[model samples]
Target: ILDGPYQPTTFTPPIDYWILINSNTNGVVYESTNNSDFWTAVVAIEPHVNPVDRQYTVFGENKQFNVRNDSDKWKFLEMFRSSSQNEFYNRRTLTSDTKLVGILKYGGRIWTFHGETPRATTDSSNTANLNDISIIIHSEFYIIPRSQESKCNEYINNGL
Candidate 1:
């Protein structure tokens, strides 16, 4: 129901809606420090699909980026260690070009979603290669429960 980068988030996912949630970024820099510390995350629920169907799902889009005038600046959406009362979503950009690297439950604790551009020269340069490095993530889930239809209708009638 909400996208994040905020601190101490709370709320139970609506059983009706698919409860779409994510942590994405566009323009942030890699500061070889504890910036990754804030990148930690926690989800309240293990994110179940359907009790009858059990069709839980997750994904990471593999989109490449050319930065620092070098090829293969790979970045992708990442998820980590999911379970009951412990789940998280992570977005990481490799400082050095390497391997190109979800959830049923939506609400949780301070799960961090970080976004950043690589250093320009791959050295200790503070500059980032500004190459319109737009990272966009769009995902969808299908919940064909019969109850949701009427709930959505009621939701729509009130205000969305």
Candidate 2:
């Protein structure tokens, strides 16, 4: 179980693993200067409860970030285990504060995952059965000029 507050720079989990897959870009150029071109990237987590895929697209113009929630339901459980403190009930939400040790670029966007859970849970029954459970988080960020500007405009317009 994760025992401390979310610290992106220092926290580390006992067991952590990840896989990355390269995706094809749509060749959407965001910048007309030089070889600066825009492209889309995809990140997939296997054995995930949700069948949906997470995607991030990047461009060269304004530097925008986008996250696609293709899943119908919120897959918070897959992010942090039930044992963790931020178990859907607590106000604690996984963000940049959560430790993400590794980062990579595929297609156009960046992909990474947090390394620790927010809390811990103890279940004697599950332990006896040799069942190990942990939280799995998948995140993707896209950089684009127009997309970024639009998102910023929406946020400011909505007072968010």
Candidate 3:
């Protein structure tokens, strides 16, 4: 059974908890302390998806598109459509050892994260210090229940 503050609007998972009974075997479960910790565990369920079909790749202890430095402030990154050159510009200036907050669309799904670079840089074009960067991606998915009227209300009423 799910517990704690069920904040569905933000798509934030129930903190310090676990899903004992999950329907999707291939589903992933992750948690973070202080919203910036590294290392997430993938709870095993049945009927796992084929490695080829999964857009996200798991490599040893770290998952592809996952892993971020948890030692700095976050910043905004970029946005773009599935197929667009302009890339829906929304770039922000980066400070020394600052984190990056970005929203990326992959496989028709939106993923959000807070990341940061580890060192100082001179290049204005280089927003982040790619040498040693950390990006923490949120795990929960935002959904609107059928019974609720507005998405906000639905999230407030039922756990998303």
Candidate 4:
């Protein structure tokens, strides 16, 4: 905590991975801001989503640190998995004590996937997401990583 109260250091996510593309799959912190404690993330994608050339599929989960002390330090926080081009499931941490302290709600995007994926499925469901072809998106349809992170319409409303 002696970093002199540095400004929130936000890390940028990958801009595509496929066709010989390889990722560390470890210590992959999708984004992090120094204004907080720990920020860790795991993201994977399908090379294609919509028939459109720019759309893509993304799957990721994360955990971070922020607490008063030791017992209150580490805990599970949030998770995300893409379901469709305009849909994603958001699991937000509701309690700092236990899980299921999480909630199911629609939100937090920058990802785009096709509509037939699945409306409901566990993170590990074999059919929950696309398979066979492992792809990564740093696509044009996903214009911004987060809503607040951009001014453009994610290629949808922007007429892409």
Candidate 5:
């Protein structure tokens, strides 16, 4: 349901098989396991180093790209595609100790979270502190919906 956090999530697709973008590119794709109805997936890219960009990743729990100590104050702004891409309507931001992404559909089609991967070192430390939010769709939405796995593909696709 993505209502709360789900620590230690796994990216169902083959570890290195990225479908949306090149595996060699600087990003990542995270998805839920098969055996379910509402499939959840996330694709995030690394942020640029403009210091203080318009769309920031910021401190707190919104560490989309990386973290900062002092000079890295503007490090969080890397989550957005660019200044022009910052204005995303209908988007909702959430903070959770557990990495839980809501599962929703798009026009009856399978839905996938689209954004840059966390290209930062902060996550490395978070691996040990499983309490860290190691994943984010940036502007992705995770609204709770009535449980329904009665039909459809059932996430037949497993690891690539």
Candidate 6:
């Protein structure tokens, strides 16, 4: 479960609640609260082949979820594609310090978060900083999900 601020953008009203449930699938589940399952919604992550386009894909059940600030210094694919030749390059620079991780739209609003991944070699698995958010998917959501296996770790390791 993840919880954070619900600010659609800098121009919208700030709310105090946003909740997501990681069922270990390619997408995440959004609920009204962390303790109940009133109205659930699933939002998937789509890493654009160009990385410069729409990075977040909300499956068939849609919204305005988006991904930004993904490390353009390295191609989202190249970072994992050459693994058999240079595994070290697979490690990316994703940190919770000021890094706006993900943004997702549900119930006509947005939910985003920041996280900690202090190590480049750590497969970029981000843990939403319990106190921050920006409404996007974790860097790990791209390469990790088997979309399974450690949820997102396998995608990064095997470059599958």
**How would you encode candidate 1's per-residue C-alpha lDDT over 1-160 as one tens digit per residue?**
3233223233333322332222223221211111222221211112222222111132222222222212233233333322323344333323222211111212222211223232211111111221211122232222223234343223212213
**Full-model lDDT, candidate 5:** 0.24
Pairs that clash in candidate 1? 28-116, 41-111, 47-104, 47-105
Q: What TM-score do all the candidates reach, one by one?
A: 0.19, 0.15, 0.20, 0.19, 0.20, 0.21
Whole-model alpha-carbon lDDT for candidate 1: 0.24
Compared with the true structure, what per-residue lDDT tens digits does model 6 show for residues 1-160?
A: 2233232221211233222222223233221111111122233333322323332232222333333334322222112111122221212223332222322333333333322333222222223231222332322222111212242232222222
Model 6 Cα displacement at 74 (Å)? 15
- Model 1 regions more than 4 Å off: 1-9, 21-76, 82-160
lDDT of each model, Cα atoms only?
0.24, 0.22, 0.25, 0.22, 0.24, 0.26
| Prediction 4 TM-score vs. true | 0.19
Tens-place lDDT per residue, model 5, 108-149, is 233332221221111100011122112323332222332432
Better candidate number, 1 or 3, judged by TM-score: 3
Give each model's clash number. 4, 8, 8, 3, 12, 17
Q: Which residue pairs collide in model 2, if any?
A: 2-119, 59-143, 62-145, 64-144, 83-120, 83-121, 84-119, 85-119
Off by over 4 Å in 5: 1-90, 106-160
Cα lDDT of candidate 2 equals 0.22
Instruction: Indicate the worst ten consecutive residues by lDDT in candidate 2.
Output: 26-35
Error of 4 at 25 (Å): 11
Model 2: CA > 4 A from native: 10-12, 15-54, 57-73, 76-160
* Best prediction by lDDT: 6
Model 4 — which ten-residue stretch has the worst lDDT? 97-106
Candidate that beats the other on lDDT, 3 or 4, i.e. the better one: 3
